Design a protein around this nucleic acid. Structure first.
Ligand SMILES: Cc1cc2nc3c(=O)[nH]c(=O)nc-3n(C[C@H](O)[C@H](O)[C@H](O)COP(=O)(O)OP(=O)(O)OC[C@H]3O[C@@H](n4cnc5c(N)ncnc54)[C@H](O)[C@@H]3O)c2cc1C
Length: 456
DNA sequence: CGGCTCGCGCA
DNA sequence: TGCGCGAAGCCGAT
């Protein structure tokens, strides 16, 4: 659909029909940003060709009840800034509350939308919402992959077994899709309160808050300032003083040598393509640059591939055949310890290293990348069954992680528990051939004592 | 057949 | 600390 700096492969038609005479409505669900948003840019270009204004519609679902205050405030303060940024470009934004399958279809009919465009997410509930929109509307419906550098349906057409099978495919398409973003043009044609939605939601999630013994909240909200502007500064700081040492100290939780970009990446407050463009041009350690690029390009986008082609990405059935057979044979093995969800949640296990990992998650909302493996694998070792451990790991991940409820989370848990995108290892009791980590193994890599004392 | 994102002995 | 082997199933280039 026209455009000189737009690859047509980033868009795909979900519904074909007669284009209406009204404004083009952009349904924002995953990429909550104004700059470096392909879905917003593609919606603006279609509006420009048809001589119509562009409007942004967001649907606030009841999903925040399952999560906590920390993610709700992080998102809401992000959208409040996004409202002002879109207003500076004369692009009105509408915030709806209710079922997306019913309210979004009603908005298109009420506002007489000419064309509807939305971002891409391989999550199950997004596809269900999309199908309900299809049956209700008659305007054309398009979908744009504004999250991945290479669109998920173009990088691969099947479930990839491992990265070494996905890395050559992904890197082969970099010269085509790795390009600079064009500036978003303001609207020429001019035509609920976010504060009220925030105050009402907070009161509902107040009883479910995480508290200490003295009825004091555990979450520390000053570690990550939400929004698009703050996400840019985090990326700038990481490239400047942190990217050089990333290759060596990325596995040391005692050092703050990570990019800390996951909370902004999950909510789409910064584009991974923009980060890739800046990292590529930056002159840093070649080993560190390669290590970081493998995480933000191969592993981040292969998680989207895993969820898009495996609808049961959060289930035991998504595990490979070798993993299921090994875990099934060890179902009746006696576990060293058995802990419930509440015991895991409160960090009341015999392992000080595991408790410190959970305490960091409870306080900061973002556990270090290395300890998250030990966090998830010990859940498998000290649970009733691999189904319960998968249930517990997912429940704690999506509740307390700022970057939770993300395809990286489900694929990351499947790696640690089900060996997805991994290989078999030495046979062991209970865990079987799933990759094994030990407290002693962490002692030979980093100062475990410093990590434990930092989080009680 | 080669090579994949742990533990462990060893400088 | 960094290095090399060990224990293990399978994809994919042929
Ligand atoms: C059991 C488990 C659960 C996880 N839960 C989540 C989750 O809910 N949400 C989430 O976003 N990530 C999750 N991850 C992935 C990983 O822990 C985080 O992406 C990362 O630790 C966030 O810190 P960072 O961005 O500073 O790391 P960095 O090293 O700076 O990572 C840079 C970026 O690369 C991507 N990335 C890095 N490591 C991975 C990985 N292993 N898999 C996929 N993408 C990766 C992310 O987009 C991240 O923002 C989980 C991992 C495991 C093992």
């Amino acid at each position: 659909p026209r455009g000189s700096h737009m690859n047509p492969k980033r868009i795909r038609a979900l519904k074909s029909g007669k284009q209406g005479d009204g404004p083009v409505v952009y349904w924002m669900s995953r990429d909550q940003r104004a700059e470096d948003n392909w879905a917003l840019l593609f919606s603006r270009a279609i509006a420009k060709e048809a001589n119509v204004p562009v409007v942004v519609v967001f649907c606030l679902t009841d999903e925040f009840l399952e999560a906590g205050i920390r993610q709700y405030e992080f998102m809401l303060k992000g959208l409040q800034e996004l409202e002002v940024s879109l207003s500076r470009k004369k692009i009105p934004s509408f915030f709806l509350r209710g079922d997306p399958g019913e309210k979004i279809s009603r908005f298109v009919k009420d506002y007489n939308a000419g064309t509807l465009v939305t971002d891409f997410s391989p999550l199950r509930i997004k596809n269900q919402w999309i199908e309900k929109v299809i049956s209700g509307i008659s305007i054309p419906f398009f979908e744009v992959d504004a999250h991945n550098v290479v669109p998920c349906w173009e990088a691969s057409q099947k479930h990839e077994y491992a990265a070494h099978t996905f890395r050559p495919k992904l890197y082969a398409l970099l010269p085509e899709f790795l390009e600079e973003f064009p500036e978003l043009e303001p609207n020429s044609v001019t035509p609920e309160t976010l504060s009220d939605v925030l105050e009402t939601g907070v009161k509902a999630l107040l009883p479910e808050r995480a508290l200490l013994k003295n009825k004091d909240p555990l979450f520390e909200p000053w570690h990550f300032e939400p929004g698009e502007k703050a996400a840019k500064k985090v990326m700038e700081s990481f490239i400047a003083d942190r990217l050089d040492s990333y290759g060596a100290l990325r596995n040391d939780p005692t050092k703050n040598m990570l990019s800390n970009l996951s909370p902004y990446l999950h909510f789409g407050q910064i584009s991974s393509q923009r980060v890739v463009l800046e990292v590529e041009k930056a002159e840093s350690n070649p080993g560190s640059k390669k290590a970081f690029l493998d995480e933000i390009l191969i592993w981040k986008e292969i998680s989207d591939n895993f969820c898009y082609y495996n609808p049961g990405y959060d289930g035991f059935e998504s595990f490979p055949s070798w993993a299921k057979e090994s875990l099934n044979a060890h179902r009746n093995d006696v576990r060293s310890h058995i802990y419930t969800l509440e015991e895991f949640e409160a960090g009341k296990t015999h392992d000080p290293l595991w408790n410190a990992s959970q305490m960091e998650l409870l306080s900061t909302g973002k556990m270090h990348g290395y300890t998250r493996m030990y966090w998830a694998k010990k859940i498998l070792e000290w649970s009733e069954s691999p189904e319960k451990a998968l249930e517990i790991a997912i429940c704690l991940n999506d509740r307390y992680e700022l970057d939770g409820r993300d395809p990286n989370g489900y694929a990351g848990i499947a790696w640690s528990i089900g060996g997805v995108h991994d290989r078999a290892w030495g046979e062991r009791e209970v865990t079987g051939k799933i990759r094994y980590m030990s407290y002693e193994g962490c002692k030979r890599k980093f100062d475990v004592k410093l990590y434990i004392e930092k989080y009680s």
